[PDB]
Amino acid sequence: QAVLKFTTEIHPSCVTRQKVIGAGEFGEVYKGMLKTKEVPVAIKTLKAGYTEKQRVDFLGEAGIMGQFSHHNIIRLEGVISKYKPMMIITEYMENGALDKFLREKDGEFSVLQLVGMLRGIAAGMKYLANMNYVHRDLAARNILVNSNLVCKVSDFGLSGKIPIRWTAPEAISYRKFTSASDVWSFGIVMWEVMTYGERPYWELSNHEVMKAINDGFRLPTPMDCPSAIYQLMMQCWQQERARRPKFADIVSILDKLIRAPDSLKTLADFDPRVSIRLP
């Protein structure tokens, strides 16, 4: 019962599951409604037959989500633990996940709006890191966008596909996941946002990505990208873990750039892949 100390217990009569929107570890995820007039929610279930480890992980997940209370972290509405199936219930965003959102809205936002999304993501990550929580799977697909353009860090589980091109070298090579490997991932998220959801490294295979990184290559600047933003993402990709900025440094820089917005007018040179010659 101590694991669920920051959570509210929801009675099953208050929950209506409507459509399957995904799969959990041992159950389905649904889009539904919560009566507490009604509010749309996402609902992850733990279905009959779950193992002891699955129960420990499921209630542990609920417990930490209840612990987190931050503008840029997905909100837990509550948990059903006293009845079967057990459920984790979160807020729901009609705009959905950030990766698909940006790809469907290519070129529709200002630079200031894009950088503001990154400041929010960075604030959520600073909070998680300070709370001693290592995310391990930070990517645009794990970020929800609300109707105010506020980004909420989430974790929907692996898509399970290993996200090599979001993962820092030390986490791939020897399983060292820390808030500094999350900083590497945040740099990739910065590139995802500024490109409107382009695939990191394009058609390179996972092996080719790792080889390029080991050889010293890094993603080139997005089109129309502020110089300061590319400089920042490049510093997230330092091979030496200890040289990367901490999330506190990232938040501070992004906040200062937004508050002095002329700083974002200086653009990094874009390397064109194709030359068009006209008079």
Ligand X SMILES: Cc1ccc(C(=O)Nc2cccc(C(F)(F)F)c2)cc1Nc1nc(N2CC[C@H](O)C2)nc(-n2ccnc2)n1
Q: How many residues bind ligand X (CB under 6 A)?
A: 23
Say whether 275 sits in a helix, a strand or coil.
coil
Among 7, 27, 32, 44, indicate the residue that binds ligand X (CB under 6 A): 44
CA dihedral defined by 195, 198, 199, 204, rounded to 10 degrees?
Answer: -80
Does residue 154 touch ligand X according to CB under 6 A? yes
Among 9, 11, 22, 69, indicate the residue that binds ligand X (CB under 6 A): 22
Integer Cα distance of 109 and 132 in angstroms:
33
Return the range that interacts with ligand X (CB under 6 A); candidates 36-44, 52-60, 166-174, 262-270: 36-44
Out of 137, 255, 269, 271, which one is annotated catalytic? 137
Is 26 part of any known ligand binding site?
yes
Integer Cα distance of 66 and 76 in angstroms:
6
Is the omega angle on the peptide bond into residue 85 within 30 degrees of 0, that is, cis? yes
Q: Helices (DSSP H) in the chain: which residue ranges? A: 52-67, 98-103, 111-130, 169-174, 179-194, 206-214, 227-236, 247-259
Does residue 143 touch ligand X according to CB under 6 A? no
Does residue 88 touch ligand X according to CB under 6 A? yes
For the annotated binding site for ATP, the residues are 21-29, 44
Applying CB under 6 A, which residues contact ligand X? Answer: 21-22, 29, 42-44, 61, 65, 68, 73-74, 88, 90, 92-93, 96, 128, 135, 144, 153-156
Annotated catalytic sites, by residue?
Answer: 137
